[PDB]
Amino acid sequence: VDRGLASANVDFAFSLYKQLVLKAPDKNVIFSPLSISTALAFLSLGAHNTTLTEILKGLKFNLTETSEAEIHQSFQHLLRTLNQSSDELQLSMGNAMFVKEQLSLLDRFTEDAKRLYGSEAFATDFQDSAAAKKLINDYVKNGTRGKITDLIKDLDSQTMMVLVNYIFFKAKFEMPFDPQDTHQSRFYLSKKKYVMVPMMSLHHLTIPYFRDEELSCTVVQLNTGNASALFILPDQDKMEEVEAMLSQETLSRFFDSLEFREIGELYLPKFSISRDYNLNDILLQLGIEEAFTSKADLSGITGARNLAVSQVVHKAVLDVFEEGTERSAATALEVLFQ
């Protein structure tokens, strides 16, 4: 079960990554694969037939290796681990459904949604579009502690439901950078194109390290957790080559080959990046198609085939600074009547 979930998880994340890159290969990318898959798995609690199997297969699950109940139990357990507080990290993760006030939901669905995904149901007047957008955007703003502010830009006044996930991940560096040692330095977009950025620096530090000569890249860890950050640094003009090798096989080789090593100097930029996306094109390419058409079967939500997905949107933010890092993301799945 676990190795089956792991294979699905990595395959979904890297498949999504490459599709995001394909739309604009030179842009910064920041996203949360788990936020997106959690929203879709939550949706699948109410799906049936081809609509259900397409969602679960689009998340790269094999339903003969891992049952539906085993998939939802994995999400439930994970969601619980992503709500933690300590002097080294703050983690939050939440799900919600915003539902047209009069709309009847099956008890099985609202029971499953609360138990497995932690989701409440918020009665919402979508016909007052500005107020409904503020309600949802405020929920995400609260959950991401101000970092994701405008997840919903446009919202159909005839919306029936919006399923929302957010994730917040703030982590202190075990060895913080001293801001006195941050100085403007070149960042090479390519061998011949470069800008000046504030570059943090540390001397004489012992971190997990792997020089991968076959892939022309260096892999390190900054930071002790149950989910530590891996940094992958391709040699100049080898990013495309490294991206082409991303796989479960390559990731496990990276992790298995890390060794503690004394590093003379480490330079890392101080920066923030943000991206937002509409994921309809990509989810259709992953084979999640019936959920978007009038053949959609979401009758596990309401007792009738009277709902279909209209829009899936995602926004994510990454902040890197001397004391540590902050990451946040949110996903909204918008649903119309049929």
Partner: protein, 34 residues
């Protein structure tokens, strides 16, 4: 003697130890950009 200099595009990945769920992934092509 070893130097690690993030002055060119790089990736970051946050991986759950037990499930290999990817919580976050990023490619930084220009830290003064989008």
């Amino acid at each position: 003697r070893t130097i690690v200099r993030f002055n060119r595009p790089f990736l970051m990945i946050i991986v759950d130890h037990f499930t290999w769920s990817i919580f976050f992934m990023s490619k930084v092509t220009n830290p003064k950009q989008a």
